[PDB]
Amino acid sequence: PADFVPDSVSGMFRSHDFSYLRLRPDHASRPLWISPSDGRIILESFSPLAEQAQDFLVTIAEPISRPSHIHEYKITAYSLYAAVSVGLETDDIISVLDRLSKVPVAESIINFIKGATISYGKVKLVIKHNRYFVETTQADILQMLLNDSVIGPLRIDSDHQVQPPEDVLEREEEDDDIDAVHSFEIANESVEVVKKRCQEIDYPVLEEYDFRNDHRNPDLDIDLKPSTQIRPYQEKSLSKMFGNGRARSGIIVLPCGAGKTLVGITAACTIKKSVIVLCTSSVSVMQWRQQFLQWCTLQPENCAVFTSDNKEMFQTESGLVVSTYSMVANTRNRSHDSQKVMDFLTGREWGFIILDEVHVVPAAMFRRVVSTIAAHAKLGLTATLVREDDKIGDLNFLIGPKLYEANWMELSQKGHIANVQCAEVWCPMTAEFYQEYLRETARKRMLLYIMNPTKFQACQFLIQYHERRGDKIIVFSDNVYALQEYALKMGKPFIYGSTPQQERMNILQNFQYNDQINTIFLSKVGDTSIDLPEATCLIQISSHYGSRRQEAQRLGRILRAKRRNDEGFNAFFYSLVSKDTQEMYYSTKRQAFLVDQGYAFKVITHLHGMENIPNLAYASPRERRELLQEVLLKNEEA
DNA sequence: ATGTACAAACACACATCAAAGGTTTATAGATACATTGAAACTTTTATATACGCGCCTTTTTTTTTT
Numbered sequence: 276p277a278d279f280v281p282d283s284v285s286g287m288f289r290s291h292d293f294s295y296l297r298l299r300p301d302h303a304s305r306p307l308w309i310s311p312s313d314g315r316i317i318l319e320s321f322s323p324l325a326e327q328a329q330d331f332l333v334t335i336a337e338p339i340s341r342p343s344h345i346h347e348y349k350i351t352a353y354s355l356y357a358a359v360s361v362g363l364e365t366d367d368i369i370s371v372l373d374r375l376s377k378v379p380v381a382e383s384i385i386n387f388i389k390g391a392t393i394s395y396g397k398v399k400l401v402i403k404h405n406r407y408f409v410e411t412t413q414a415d416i417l418q419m420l421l422n423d424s425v426i427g428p429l430r431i432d433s434d435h436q437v438q439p440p441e442d443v444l445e446r447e448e449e450d451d452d453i454d455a456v457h458s459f460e461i462a463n464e465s466v467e468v469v470k471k472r473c474q475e476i477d478y479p480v481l482e483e484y485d486f487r488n489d490h491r492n493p494d495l496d497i498d499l500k501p502s503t504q505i506r507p508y509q510e511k512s513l514s515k516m517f518g519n520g521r522a523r524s525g526i527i528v529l530p531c532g533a534g535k536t537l538v539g540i541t542a543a544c545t546i547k548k549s550v551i552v553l554c555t556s557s558v559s560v561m562q563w564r565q566q567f568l569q570w571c572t573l574q575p576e577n578c579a580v581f582t583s584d585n586k587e588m589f590q591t592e593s594g595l596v597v598s599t600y601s602m603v604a605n606t607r608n609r610s611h612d613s614q615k616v617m618d619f620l621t622g623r624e625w626g627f628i629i630l631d632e633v634h635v636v637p638a639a640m641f642r643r644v645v646s647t648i649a650a651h652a653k654l655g656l657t658a659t660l661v662r663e664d665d666k667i668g669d670l671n672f673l674i675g676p677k678l679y680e681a682n683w684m685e686l687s688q689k690g691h692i693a694n695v696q697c698a699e700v701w702c703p704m705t706a707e708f709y710q711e712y713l714r715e716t717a718r719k720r721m722l723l724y725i726m727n728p729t730k731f732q733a734c735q736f737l738i739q740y741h742e743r744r745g746d747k748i749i750v751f752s753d754n755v756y757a758l759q760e761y762a763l764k765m766g767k768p769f770i771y772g773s774t775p776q777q778e779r780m781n782i783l784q785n786f787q788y789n790d791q792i793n794t795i796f797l798s799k800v801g802d803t804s805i806d807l808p809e810a811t812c813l814i815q816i817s818s819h820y821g822s823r824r825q826e827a828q829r830l831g832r833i834l835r836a837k838r839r840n841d842e843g844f845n846a847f848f849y850s851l852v853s854k855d856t857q858e859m860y861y862s863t864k865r866q867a868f869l870v871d872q873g874y875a876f877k878v879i880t881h882l883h884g885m886e887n888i889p890n891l892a893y894a895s896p897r898e899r900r901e902l903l904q905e906v907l908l909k910n911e912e913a
Numbered sequence: 914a915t916g917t918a919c920a921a922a923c924a925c926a927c928a929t930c931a932a933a934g935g936t937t938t939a940t941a942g943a944t945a946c947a948t949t950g951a952a953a954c955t956t957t958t959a960t961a962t963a964c965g966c967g968c969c970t971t972t973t974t975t976t977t978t979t
Contacts (some may be wrong), residue, residue, distance in 0.1 A: 369967075378951070555921095556920090558920090600919085601921055601922090602922090604921090606922090608922075609922065609923065646914040717917095718917090718918095799918090803920085
């Protein structure tokens with residue numbers, strides 16, 4: 276509602292029917308011919324020079340970049356919406372498609388492309404010279420201010436004001452769209468629904484949140500601080516929040532943890548206003564304050580963070596703020612002095628708000644921040660946008676769709692993010708558990724899946740292989756119930772939820788730079804803390820449907836957060852896939868976007884040498900049939 | 914429809930901190946011997962003088978067995 280779904284929907288514009296091709300225009304003109312109606316991308320015989328052409332292709336659709344002449348392409352509806360930042364000559368892309376009119380030129384698609392170039396940069400929501408107003412700016416969304424009632428009748432005929440930009444400032448459209456068809460000064464009351472009304476009245480309107488163009492502020496408790504540096508993937512995001520008129524903001528999809536505070540530093544530094552920051556959990560947040568927050572540009576003293584047990588200095592500093600949603604994303608609240616903090620900052624006209632990895636966060640709890648801050652601008656930072664909660668209003672119509680993707684196979688040609696060759700070992704199955712798996716019921720069937728004799732024979736082989744060629748391991752699995760049994764039946768450490776803080780320390784200290792106790796297991800809450808800077812030998816064993824997304828996201832921090840820049844980087848991933856079992860199809864459906872990312876995958880049902888393992892307990896299958904007798908228990912508890 | 918493993922509050926059961934105190938003992942006060950050198954102390958005598966007292970020495974009296 277306030278936000279819009281439009282941030283997780285790539286792979287579109289595929290305009291082609293049972294008779295798509297028109298009289299091949301590019302048939303004669305063969306310098307370049309992408310799939311037009313689709314928006315697909317394909318080179319032409321009068322034109323093979325590719326590498327420099329990365330950017331032009333970046334404007335449209337999805338490639339196949341292990342393609343030879345070129346990679347693939349596609350149309351994208353909101354994709355043109357993103358392109359407005361440059362906002363170049365619209366027909367030029369069509370003019371570029373002029374040669375690329377491969378079939379008879381799909382003017383309809385071209386119009387669709389002209390349409391594909393309709394919204395972004397054609398935004399419409401008024402603003403005024405140190406205030407906000409009820410007008411509109413570009414053709415794509417112009418009326419998204421003027422004809423309105425929360426933007427038009429919620430646009431107030433006030434003439435013009437920077438100093439007069441405050442009383443109203445039908446709430447602060449300080450982040451209004453492109454502005455000023457006759458712009459009626461914006462008010463102070465009711466856009467918390469406008470953001471909902473927007474797509475409700477479906478205005479593809481390009482929000483704009485300025486750098487100094489709202490003098491409801493003698494611009495407030497920030498200031499520019501640029502000390503930072505840049506790896507090859509920054510600047511676009513930074514200038515991505517400028518546009519036309521006055522500045523703006525948006526949403527960006529990233530493998531996070533890359534000093535994303537630093538990019539957060541800039542835009543906040545570049546508005547000098549009131550801003551707050553948010554992260555998941557005192558479980559999660561502390562990987563932020565002090566190894567990647569001070570090599571940067573901020574003074575050492577200001578901010579406060581709040582848990583009323585992990586509390587700070589509140590009622591104290593005029594400067595900026597930082598908190599957690601789930602803290603107040605709920606009627607959860609520890610010390611009523613929280614409501615000594617709650618009321619203002621909630622009610623406070625924050626210039627900007629920072630939300631981070633809201634991906635897992637549900638509307639059923641995510642709407643609180645929507646109902647909490649309503650800051651004049653917002654930060655969009657999560658893991659993945661194609662989702663399971665693909666529901667109606669994603670945070671876009673609040674902030675925007677994804678602004679910057681990542682880049683993996685050919686920009687990382689500046690910085691190698693950990694060359695991957697994924698492995699899935701296709702271990703067959705025995706009916707012995709499986710027979711009563713044919714007798715099972717609700718997901719307590721899946722426990723039987725965990726009862727596979729094959730995992731063991733391979734499990735050590737993985738440990739053996741890794742150390743037979745001598746590189747240490749990081750493993751992935753689930754369902755601790757017996758997976759914990761696996762651990763100290765693997766000769767390897769056990770890790771489990773519902774665990775005291777004390778014991779968490781003994782895991783790493785005489786363990787990291789040592790070279791002997793070189794194996795690890797993972798829980799379902801421990802993954803919410805950290806992964807080692809070591810052992811990119813990545814082995815999946817056990818997972819679970821739906822979690823697949825975050826499970827796949829869970830795999831992310833290992834490699835992408837790594838940045839070392841060697842020649843090859845012979846790194847690999849591995850996984851356990853017990854054959855003839857309920858999940859692998861869903862795992863293939865999980866695999867369905869594995870090499871989507873270009874980070875590839877190779878399969879081995881059996882390698883050269885899996886059986887080389889003589890230390891496996893249950894070497895003969897009667898212990899595996901002893902296992903059957905233990906296999907009963909929990910599934911006889913079940 | 915439909916509730917379930919999973920992890921955030923939210924106030925609390927759990928491991929920790931800290932004041933108090935018997936007991937031990939160097940550690941020191943005070944202690945009782947251990948040293949020794951040092952000066953305050955002893956001896957002749959004879960010599961008469963003019964004493965006693967006890968002891969040299971002896972005269973007179975005093976007391977058991979055949």
